[PDB]
RNA sequence: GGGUCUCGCGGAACCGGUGAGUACACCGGAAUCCAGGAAACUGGAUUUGGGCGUGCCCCCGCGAGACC
Protein backbone atom coordinates (compact mmCIF):
# COMPACT_ATOMS: atom_id res chain seq x y z
CA UNK A 1 0.00 0.00 0.00
CA UNK A 2 1.77 3.17 1.15
CA UNK A 3 5.26 3.02 0.36
CA UNK A 4 8.38 5.11 0.63
CA UNK A 5 11.77 4.46 -0.78
CA UNK A 6 14.81 5.65 -0.49
CA UNK A 7 17.43 5.44 -3.06
CA UNK A 8 20.94 6.88 -4.05
CA UNK A 9 22.70 6.42 -1.13
CA UNK A 10 26.41 5.40 -1.50
CA UNK A 11 30.17 5.91 -0.91
CA UNK A 12 31.82 9.59 -2.18
CA UNK A 13 35.15 11.27 -0.82
CA UNK A 14 34.85 14.47 1.22
CA UNK A 15 33.56 17.66 -0.97
CA UNK A 16 31.96 15.32 -3.43
CA UNK A 17 28.15 15.15 -4.35
CA UNK A 18 25.30 12.86 -4.22
CA UNK A 19 21.15 12.75 -4.56
CA UNK A 20 18.70 11.27 -2.92
CA UNK A 21 15.69 10.35 -4.36
CA UNK A 22 12.53 9.32 -2.11
CA UNK A 23 9.44 7.95 -4.38
CA UNK A 24 5.99 7.27 -2.83
CA UNK A 25 3.51 5.17 -3.76
CA UNK A 26 -0.40 4.58 -2.74
CA UNK A 27 -0.82 8.30 -1.92
CA UNK A 28 0.13 11.51 -3.07
CA UNK A 29 2.61 13.61 -1.92
CA UNK A 30 1.22 16.63 -2.95
CA UNK A 31 -1.27 15.83 0.12
CA UNK A 32 1.48 15.72 2.59
CA UNK A 33 4.71 17.49 3.33
CA UNK A 34 8.14 15.12 2.98
CA UNK A 35 10.73 15.18 5.61
CA UNK A 36 14.35 14.00 5.28
CA UNK A 37 15.83 12.80 8.57
CA UNK A 38 19.31 11.33 9.16
CA UNK A 39 20.78 8.82 11.58
CA UNK A 40 24.52 8.63 12.22
CA UNK A 41 25.97 5.12 13.05
CA UNK A 42 25.03 4.84 17.23
CA UNK A 43 23.24 8.14 17.46
CA UNK A 44 19.82 9.76 17.48
CA UNK A 45 17.29 11.24 14.94
CA UNK A 46 18.49 14.75 13.38
CA UNK A 47 16.10 16.79 10.82
CA UNK A 48 17.79 17.28 7.70
CA UNK A 49 14.99 19.02 5.50
CA UNK A 50 11.12 19.74 5.15
CA UNK A 51 9.15 20.59 1.65
CA UNK A 52 5.43 21.24 0.96
CA UNK A 53 5.36 19.85 -2.58
CA UNK A 54 2.14 21.63 -3.20
CA UNK A 55 4.04 25.08 -2.67
CA UNK A 56 7.71 24.34 -2.71
CA UNK A 57 8.39 25.88 0.21
CA UNK A 58 11.86 24.73 1.72
CA UNK A 59 13.44 24.53 5.22
CA UNK A 60 16.77 23.24 5.95
CA UNK A 61 18.82 22.17 9.66
CA UNK A 62 21.33 24.76 10.51
CA UNK A 63 23.92 22.13 10.30
CA UNK A 64 23.05 21.71 5.87
CA UNK A 65 22.28 25.13 4.88
CA UNK A 66 23.86 26.18 1.44
CA UNK A 67 25.32 22.58 1.00
CA UNK A 68 21.65 20.51 0.86
CA UNK A 69 18.62 21.51 -1.54
CA UNK A 70 15.27 19.37 -1.18
CA UNK A 71 12.60 19.26 -4.13
CA UNK A 72 9.61 17.35 -5.10
CA UNK A 73 8.42 16.39 -8.51
CA UNK A 74 4.33 15.71 -8.18
CA UNK A 75 4.61 14.41 -11.57
CA UNK A 76 6.72 11.33 -10.53
CA UNK A 77 5.11 11.50 -6.99
CA UNK A 78 9.11 11.79 -5.84
CA UNK A 79 11.33 14.08 -3.66
CA UNK A 80 14.59 14.09 -3.78
CA UNK A 81 17.81 15.40 -1.53
CA UNK A 82 20.70 16.99 -3.65
CA UNK A 83 23.43 16.99 -1.22
CA UNK A 84 26.46 19.16 -2.75
CA UNK A 85 29.99 20.14 -0.01
CA UNK A 86 29.51 16.36 1.75
CA UNK A 87 31.68 15.76 5.15
CA UNK A 88 32.79 13.00 7.19
CA UNK A 89 29.77 14.27 9.55
CA UNK A 90 27.33 13.69 7.01
CA UNK A 91 27.23 9.72 6.78
CA UNK A 92 24.25 8.21 8.39
CA UNK A 93 20.99 6.78 7.19
CA UNK A 94 18.69 9.15 5.78
CA UNK A 95 15.18 8.56 6.29
CA UNK A 96 12.22 10.01 4.28
CA UNK A 97 8.74 10.40 5.86
CA UNK A 98 5.43 12.27 5.18
CA UNK A 99 3.22 14.53 7.22
CA UNK A 100 -0.60 14.61 6.31
CA UNK A 101 -1.97 17.89 4.90
CA UNK A 102 -0.42 20.10 2.23
CA UNK A 103 0.82 22.97 4.15
CA UNK A 104 1.49 23.07 8.06
CA UNK A 105 -0.16 20.53 10.83
CA UNK A 106 -0.18 19.03 14.04
CA UNK A 107 -0.10 15.02 12.51
CA UNK A 108 3.33 13.44 13.32
CA UNK A 109 5.29 11.86 10.90
CA UNK A 110 3.13 8.86 10.34
CA UNK A 111 5.20 6.80 7.33
CA UNK A 112 9.41 6.19 7.19
CA UNK A 113 10.60 4.62 4.65
CA UNK A 114 13.69 2.05 5.38
CA UNK A 115 16.17 4.67 4.42
CA UNK A 116 19.55 4.85 1.70
CA UNK A 117 23.06 4.45 3.55
CA UNK A 118 25.26 7.32 2.52
CA UNK A 119 29.18 7.04 3.55
CA UNK A 120 31.24 10.13 3.41
CA UNK A 121 35.16 8.83 3.59
CA UNK A 122 38.55 9.22 1.67
CA UNK A 123 39.36 5.74 2.58
CA UNK A 124 40.39 3.06 -0.07
CA UNK A 125 37.95 -0.23 0.08
CA UNK A 126 40.31 -2.99 1.98
CA UNK A 127 39.51 -6.24 3.58
CA UNK A 128 40.19 -7.41 6.85
CA UNK A 129 43.10 -8.49 8.99
CA UNK A 130 42.58 -11.39 11.10
CA UNK A 131 44.13 -12.49 14.13
CA UNK A 132 43.46 -14.92 16.86
CA UNK A 133 42.65 -14.30 20.65
CA UNK A 134 44.10 -17.36 21.86
CA UNK A 135 42.34 -18.87 24.82
CA UNK A 136 44.42 -18.35 28.17
CA UNK A 137 46.73 -20.97 29.72
CA UNK A 138 44.52 -21.31 33.00
CA UNK A 139 41.06 -22.40 33.54
CA UNK A 140 39.57 -18.87 32.97
CA UNK A 141 36.64 -18.20 35.06
CA UNK A 142 34.30 -20.83 35.96
CA UNK A 143 35.93 -23.92 34.14
CA UNK A 144 35.34 -22.04 31.09
CA UNK A 145 37.81 -20.54 28.39
CA UNK A 146 37.68 -17.28 26.17
CA UNK A 147 38.79 -17.24 23.24
CA UNK A 148 38.08 -15.17 19.38
CA UNK A 149 39.01 -13.10 16.13
CA UNK A 150 40.45 -9.75 15.74
CA UNK A 151 38.80 -8.47 12.42
CA UNK A 152 41.03 -5.49 11.98
CA UNK A 153 41.63 -2.79 9.33
CA UNK A 154 38.73 -2.99 6.85
CA UNK A 155 36.52 -0.42 4.80
CA UNK A 156 33.78 -0.13 4.22
CA UNK A 157 31.24 -1.69 6.98
CA UNK A 158 29.88 -4.44 6.64
CA UNK A 159 32.03 -7.75 7.77
CA UNK A 160 30.07 -10.57 8.28
CA UNK A 161 31.09 -13.10 11.46
CA UNK A 162 30.39 -16.94 12.21
CA UNK A 163 31.97 -19.80 14.07
CA UNK A 164 32.74 -23.18 13.03
CA UNK A 165 30.82 -22.20 9.58
CA UNK A 166 27.49 -21.55 11.88
CA UNK A 167 27.87 -24.79 13.91
CA UNK A 168 28.67 -22.44 16.55
CA UNK A 169 26.52 -19.56 18.33
CA UNK A 170 25.56 -20.09 21.67
CA UNK A 171 28.15 -18.04 23.89
CA UNK A 172 28.90 -15.62 20.99
CA UNK A 173 29.91 -12.35 20.88
CA UNK A 174 30.18 -10.29 17.96
CA UNK A 175 30.49 -6.24 19.21
CA UNK A 176 29.67 -3.86 17.04
CA UNK A 177 33.09 -2.10 14.78
CA UNK A 178 34.70 1.03 16.02
CA UNK A 179 36.01 3.60 13.01
CA UNK A 180 39.55 4.19 14.02
CA UNK A 181 41.74 7.12 13.36
CA UNK A 182 43.14 5.73 10.56
CA UNK A 183 39.76 5.88 8.65
CA UNK A 184 39.19 1.96 8.64
CA UNK A 185 37.00 -0.07 10.99
CA UNK A 186 37.97 -2.92 13.68
CA UNK A 187 35.96 -4.74 15.33
CA UNK A 188 36.51 -8.76 17.75
CA UNK A 189 34.08 -11.60 18.05
CA UNK A 190 34.63 -13.53 21.11
CA UNK A 191 33.03 -17.46 22.64
CA UNK A 192 33.24 -19.13 25.71
CA UNK A 193 33.24 -22.75 25.95
CA UNK A 194 34.36 -25.51 27.77
CA UNK A 195 37.74 -25.65 29.28
CA UNK A 196 37.49 -29.75 28.41
CA UNK A 197 37.42 -29.23 25.04
CA UNK A 198 40.14 -27.28 23.75
CA UNK A 199 42.16 -30.28 23.07
CA UNK A 200 39.39 -31.91 21.14
CA UNK A 201 37.23 -29.47 19.45
CA UNK A 202 38.76 -26.77 17.25
CA UNK A 203 37.31 -23.24 16.42
CA UNK A 204 37.46 -21.25 13.43
CA UNK A 205 36.23 -18.01 12.81
CA UNK A 206 34.92 -17.17 9.29
CA UNK A 207 34.83 -13.51 8.19
CA UNK A 208 33.48 -12.73 5.05
CA UNK A 209 33.62 -8.76 3.94
CA UNK A 210 31.72 -8.49 0.25
CA UNK A 211 33.10 -4.97 -0.80
CA UNK A 212 36.63 -6.01 -1.10
CA UNK A 213 35.66 -10.03 -2.40
CA UNK A 214 37.81 -11.26 0.55
CA UNK A 215 36.57 -14.28 2.66
CA UNK A 216 38.76 -15.74 5.51
CA UNK A 217 38.75 -18.75 7.64
CA UNK A 218 40.94 -18.53 10.78
CA UNK A 219 41.64 -21.30 13.54
CA UNK A 220 41.96 -19.63 16.99
CA UNK A 221 44.30 -22.50 19.21
CA UNK A 222 46.22 -22.11 22.42
CA UNK A 223 49.63 -20.32 22.27
CA UNK A 224 52.01 -23.01 22.91
CA UNK A 225 55.62 -23.00 24.03
CA UNK B 1 16.93 29.26 13.27
CA UNK B 2 16.76 25.70 14.66
CA UNK B 3 14.41 24.68 17.43
CA UNK B 4 15.33 22.98 20.36
CA UNK B 5 14.32 19.66 22.63
CA UNK B 6 16.12 18.65 25.62
CA UNK B 7 15.05 14.68 26.44
CA UNK B 8 15.70 12.93 29.49
CA UNK B 9 16.66 10.51 30.89
CA UNK B 10 19.17 9.17 28.36
CA UNK B 11 18.68 5.60 29.52
CA UNK B 12 16.15 3.89 31.89
CA UNK B 13 15.83 0.66 33.45
CA UNK B 14 12.69 -1.68 34.06
CA UNK B 15 10.54 -4.05 34.04
CA UNK B 16 7.75 -5.73 32.56
CA UNK B 17 4.54 -4.17 33.99
CA UNK B 18 6.42 -0.93 34.88
CA UNK B 19 5.07 2.42 34.19
CA UNK B 20 7.77 4.38 32.85
CA UNK B 21 7.92 7.74 32.28
CA UNK B 22 10.01 9.98 29.39
CA UNK B 23 10.06 13.60 28.88
CA UNK B 24 11.02 16.30 26.60
CA UNK B 25 11.19 20.31 27.40
CA UNK B 26 11.02 22.22 24.31
CA UNK B 27 13.77 25.55 24.46
CA UNK B 28 12.70 28.68 21.56
CA UNK B 29 9.19 27.22 20.63
CA UNK B 30 5.63 26.78 22.38
CA UNK B 31 4.74 24.64 19.08
CA UNK B 32 2.17 21.68 20.12
CA UNK B 33 3.26 19.41 17.34
CA UNK B 34 5.08 17.78 19.52
CA UNK B 35 5.50 13.86 18.37
CA UNK B 36 6.83 10.65 20.43
CA UNK B 37 8.45 7.92 17.87
CA UNK B 38 9.64 4.34 19.23
CA UNK B 39 12.41 2.75 17.17
CA UNK B 40 14.29 -0.59 17.67
CA UNK B 41 17.75 -1.52 16.08
CA UNK B 42 17.70 -1.71 12.39
CA UNK B 43 14.71 -0.64 11.87
CA UNK B 44 12.83 2.69 10.78
CA UNK B 45 11.10 4.87 13.74
CA UNK B 46 7.28 4.42 14.26
CA UNK B 47 5.18 7.09 15.51
CA UNK B 48 2.97 6.37 18.67
CA UNK B 49 1.53 9.75 19.73
CA UNK B 50 1.07 13.14 17.66
CA UNK B 51 -0.21 16.63 18.57
CA UNK B 52 1.64 15.73 22.58
CA UNK B 53 -1.40 13.83 23.40
CA UNK B 54 -3.27 11.71 20.27
CA UNK B 55 -2.65 8.41 19.98
CA UNK B 56 -1.72 7.15 16.73
CA UNK B 57 -3.89 4.82 15.19
CA UNK B 58 -2.49 1.07 15.63
CA UNK B 59 -0.58 1.87 19.08
CA UNK B 60 -1.79 -0.01 21.83
CA UNK B 61 -3.26 2.62 24.32
CA UNK B 62 -0.86 1.77 27.47
CA UNK B 63 0.89 4.48 24.88
CA UNK B 64 -0.06 8.19 26.15
CA UNK B 65 1.27 11.32 26.20
CA UNK B 66 0.63 15.14 28.08
CA UNK B 67 2.10 18.36 28.16
CA UNK B 68 2.28 20.83 31.15
CA UNK B 69 3.43 23.90 29.54
CA UNK B 70 7.19 23.51 28.32
CA UNK B 71 7.16 20.25 29.51
CA UNK B 72 5.95 16.80 27.01
CA UNK B 73 5.92 13.68 28.87
CA UNK B 74 5.42 9.59 27.52
CA UNK B 75 3.88 7.22 29.45
CA UNK B 76 3.91 3.84 29.21
CA UNK B 77 1.48 2.54 31.89
CA UNK B 78 2.35 -0.76 31.85
CA UNK B 79 5.51 -2.02 29.95
CA UNK B 80 5.21 -4.92 27.83
CA UNK B 81 7.95 -6.79 26.17
CA UNK B 82 8.09 -5.77 23.04
CA UNK B 83 8.40 -1.97 24.17
CA UNK B 84 11.97 -2.26 24.83
CA UNK B 85 12.95 0.21 22.71
CA UNK B 86 14.54 3.85 21.82
CA UNK B 87 12.07 6.84 22.50
CA UNK B 88 12.76 9.76 20.37
CA UNK B 89 9.93 12.89 21.29
CA UNK B 90 9.89 15.49 18.26
CA UNK B 91 8.64 19.32 18.30
CA UNK B 92 7.74 20.98 14.36
CA UNK B 93 6.80 24.29 13.48
CA UNK B 94 5.83 25.92 10.14
CA UNK B 95 9.34 25.51 8.86
CA UNK B 96 12.01 23.75 11.29
CA UNK B 97 11.49 20.22 13.06
CA UNK B 98 13.53 19.04 15.40
CA UNK B 99 14.03 16.07 17.63
CA UNK B 100 15.15 15.21 21.41
CA UNK B 101 18.31 13.10 22.18
CA UNK B 102 16.98 9.63 22.79
CA UNK B 103 16.01 7.25 25.82
CA UNK B 104 16.95 3.89 25.69
CA UNK B 105 14.41 1.70 27.99
CA UNK B 106 16.66 -1.50 28.99
CA UNK B 107 15.43 -4.93 31.06
CA UNK B 108 16.22 -4.38 34.44
CA UNK B 109 17.62 -7.67 36.36
CA UNK B 110 19.78 -8.43 39.03
CA UNK B 111 23.58 -7.13 39.62
CA UNK B 112 25.93 -9.35 37.53
CA UNK B 113 29.66 -9.03 38.16
CA UNK B 114 31.71 -9.37 34.57
CA UNK B 115 34.03 -12.61 33.62
CA UNK B 116 36.99 -10.60 32.42
CA UNK B 117 39.94 -12.06 30.78
CA UNK B 118 42.84 -10.82 28.64
CA UNK B 119 44.82 -11.15 25.02
CA UNK B 120 48.47 -10.49 23.99
CA UNK B 121 48.70 -9.74 20.12
CA UNK B 122 49.27 -12.30 18.51
CA UNK B 123 52.81 -13.18 16.71
CA UNK B 124 50.97 -12.37 13.06
CA UNK B 125 49.81 -9.56 13.82
CA UNK B 126 53.31 -8.03 15.09
CA UNK B 127 55.08 -9.25 11.72
CA UNK B 128 52.99 -6.19 10.57
CA UNK B 129 54.49 -3.50 13.13
CA UNK B 130 50.95 -3.42 15.05
CA UNK B 131 50.14 -5.15 18.46
CA UNK B 132 46.21 -4.98 19.93
CA UNK B 133 45.63 -6.33 23.32
CA UNK B 134 42.23 -6.67 24.33
CA UNK B 135 40.27 -7.22 27.58
CA UNK B 136 36.78 -8.67 27.44
CA UNK B 137 34.27 -8.14 29.64
CA UNK B 138 31.84 -11.06 29.79
CA UNK B 139 28.01 -10.70 30.69
CA UNK B 140 27.44 -8.08 33.16
CA UNK B 141 24.81 -6.35 34.41
CA UNK B 142 24.08 -2.56 34.87
CA UNK B 143 25.95 -1.53 31.69
CA UNK B 144 28.18 1.23 33.49
CA UNK B 145 31.31 -0.23 33.74
CA UNK B 146 35.50 1.28 33.95
CA UNK B 147 38.02 0.18 32.16
CA UNK B 148 41.49 1.25 32.90
CA UNK B 149 45.04 -0.11 31.28
CA UNK B 150 48.44 0.05 32.92
CA UNK B 151 51.41 -0.73 30.95
CA UNK B 152 54.65 -1.36 33.35
CA UNK B 153 52.05 -0.14 36.05
CA UNK B 154 51.88 3.15 34.14
CA UNK B 155 47.99 4.43 33.33
CA UNK B 156 47.32 4.58 29.26
CA UNK B 157 45.57 7.59 27.88
CA UNK B 158 44.53 7.88 24.60
CA UNK B 159 45.57 5.09 22.87
CA UNK B 160 42.12 2.32 23.74
CA UNK B 161 38.73 2.52 22.47
CA UNK B 162 35.95 -0.08 23.37
CA UNK B 163 32.61 -1.32 21.91
CA UNK B 164 29.84 -2.61 23.87
CA UNK B 165 27.01 -5.18 22.34
CA UNK B 166 23.62 -5.11 22.78
CA UNK B 167 21.43 -5.95 25.97
CA UNK B 168 21.76 -10.58 26.03
CA UNK B 169 18.31 -11.56 24.69
CA UNK B 170 18.47 -14.14 27.10
CA UNK B 171 19.98 -13.25 29.99
CA UNK B 172 19.74 -9.32 29.77
CA UNK B 173 23.35 -9.15 30.08
CA UNK B 174 26.06 -7.01 28.38
CA UNK B 175 29.36 -7.26 27.57
CA UNK B 176 32.43 -5.38 26.07
CA UNK B 177 36.01 -5.27 24.55
CA UNK B 178 38.62 -2.90 25.12
CA UNK B 179 41.43 -2.46 22.71
CA UNK B 180 44.26 -1.40 22.95
CA UNK B 181 46.55 -0.72 20.40
CA UNK B 182 50.29 0.35 20.36
CA UNK B 183 52.97 0.11 17.88
CA UNK B 184 55.29 -2.77 17.53
CA UNK B 185 58.36 -0.89 18.65
CA UNK B 186 56.47 0.35 21.93
CA UNK B 187 54.86 -2.94 22.99
CA UNK B 188 57.87 -4.97 22.65
CA UNK B 189 59.41 -1.69 25.62
CA UNK B 190 57.22 -3.14 28.36
CA UNK B 191 56.53 -6.12 30.34
CA UNK B 192 53.50 -5.94 32.00
CA UNK B 193 50.33 -5.23 30.53
CA UNK B 194 46.71 -4.99 32.52
CA UNK B 195 43.38 -4.07 32.23
CA UNK B 196 41.73 -3.17 35.43
CA UNK B 197 37.88 -3.02 35.78
CA UNK B 198 35.67 -1.09 37.89
CA UNK B 199 31.96 -2.17 38.29
CA UNK B 200 28.82 -2.11 40.51
CA UNK B 201 29.61 -5.99 40.79
CA UNK B 202 32.50 -5.82 42.17
CA UNK B 203 33.68 -4.82 45.88
CA UNK B 204 37.21 -3.76 44.68
CA UNK B 205 37.98 -3.58 40.97
CA UNK B 206 39.04 -7.18 38.88
CA UNK B 207 42.91 -7.05 37.36
CA UNK B 208 43.91 -9.42 34.53
CA UNK B 209 47.68 -9.31 33.63
CA UNK B 210 49.72 -10.95 31.30
CA UNK B 211 53.42 -10.57 30.70
CA UNK B 212 54.81 -10.38 27.25
CA UNK B 213 56.37 -13.64 26.20
CA UNK B 214 55.45 -15.70 29.10
CA UNK B 215 53.96 -19.30 28.98
C1' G C 1 -17.32 31.87 -23.77
C1' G C 2 -14.30 29.01 -20.81
C1' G C 3 -9.41 27.57 -19.20
C1' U C 4 -4.40 28.54 -18.10
C1' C C 5 -0.62 32.69 -18.03
C1' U C 6 1.05 38.08 -17.85
C1' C C 7 0.52 43.23 -16.71
C1' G C 8 -2.12 47.58 -14.51
C1' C C 9 -5.44 49.58 -10.70
C1' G C 10 -8.30 48.47 -6.36
C1' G C 11 -9.33 45.53 -1.50
C1' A C 12 -8.92 51.28 6.89
C1' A C 13 -4.44 51.31 11.32
C1' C C 14 -2.59 48.69 15.56
C1' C C 15 -2.52 44.32 19.40
C1' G C 16 -3.95 39.65 21.01
C1' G C 17 -6.89 34.96 21.02
C1' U C 18 -9.69 30.00 19.21
C1' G C 19 -9.87 25.85 15.44
C1' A C 20 -7.64 24.49 11.05
C1' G C 21 -3.87 23.70 7.14
C1' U C 22 -3.00 26.57 3.92
C1' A C 23 -3.50 31.36 2.36
C1' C C 24 -9.84 29.85 5.54
C1' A C 25 -13.65 30.14 9.46
C1' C C 26 -14.29 32.84 13.91
C1' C C 27 -13.54 35.93 18.65
C1' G C 28 -11.80 40.05 21.88
C1' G C 29 -9.32 44.48 22.46
C1' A C 30 -9.50 48.79 18.97
C1' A C 31 -10.71 52.63 15.62
C1' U C 32 -14.38 56.49 13.45
C1' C C 33 -19.08 59.00 14.33
C1' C C 34 -23.24 60.42 17.63
C1' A C 35 -25.27 60.97 22.61
C1' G C 36 -24.65 61.27 28.14
C1' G C 37 -21.08 62.59 32.22
C1' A C 38 -16.76 67.11 35.93
C1' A C 39 -14.19 62.59 35.43
C1' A C 40 -13.26 57.26 35.64
C1' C C 41 -16.63 55.58 32.31
C1' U C 42 -21.59 54.36 29.62
C1' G C 43 -25.19 53.63 25.54
C1' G C 44 -26.00 53.68 20.11
C1' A C 45 -24.28 53.32 14.93
C1' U C 46 -20.34 52.01 11.53
C1' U C 47 -15.75 49.41 10.39
C1' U C 48 -10.45 46.55 7.67
C1' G C 49 -9.68 39.36 2.71
C1' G C 50 -5.86 35.97 4.29
C1' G C 51 -0.59 32.94 5.09
C1' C C 52 3.95 32.89 7.29
C1' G C 53 9.64 32.74 6.67
C1' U C 54 7.68 40.58 7.79
C1' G C 55 8.60 41.14 2.77
C1' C C 56 7.41 38.09 0.05
C1' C C 57 3.19 35.13 -1.16
C1' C C 58 -2.12 33.50 -1.83
C1' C C 59 -7.08 35.07 -2.61
C1' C C 60 -11.18 38.58 -4.20
C1' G C 61 -13.04 42.81 -7.56
C1' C C 62 -12.24 45.93 -11.95
C1' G C 63 -9.35 46.79 -16.60
C1' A C 64 -5.80 45.36 -20.57
C1' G C 65 -3.31 41.58 -23.21
C1' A C 66 -0.96 36.56 -24.77
C1' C C 67 -1.87 31.51 -25.79
C1' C C 68 -5.00 27.23 -26.32
Known amino acids: ?225 | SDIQMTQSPSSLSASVGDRVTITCRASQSVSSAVAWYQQKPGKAPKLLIYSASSLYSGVPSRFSGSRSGTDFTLTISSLQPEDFATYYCQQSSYYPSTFGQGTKVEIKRTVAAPSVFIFPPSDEQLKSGTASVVCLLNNFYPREAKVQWKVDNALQSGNSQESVTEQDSKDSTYSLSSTLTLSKADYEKHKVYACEVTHQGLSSPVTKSFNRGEC
Open chain 1, 1 to 225: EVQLVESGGGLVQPGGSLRLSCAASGFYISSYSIHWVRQAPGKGLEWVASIYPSYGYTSYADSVKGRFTISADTSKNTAYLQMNSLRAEDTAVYYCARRYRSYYSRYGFDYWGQGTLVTVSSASTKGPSVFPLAPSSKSTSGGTAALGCLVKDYFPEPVTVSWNSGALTSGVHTFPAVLQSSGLYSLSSVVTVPSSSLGTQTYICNVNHKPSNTKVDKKVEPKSC
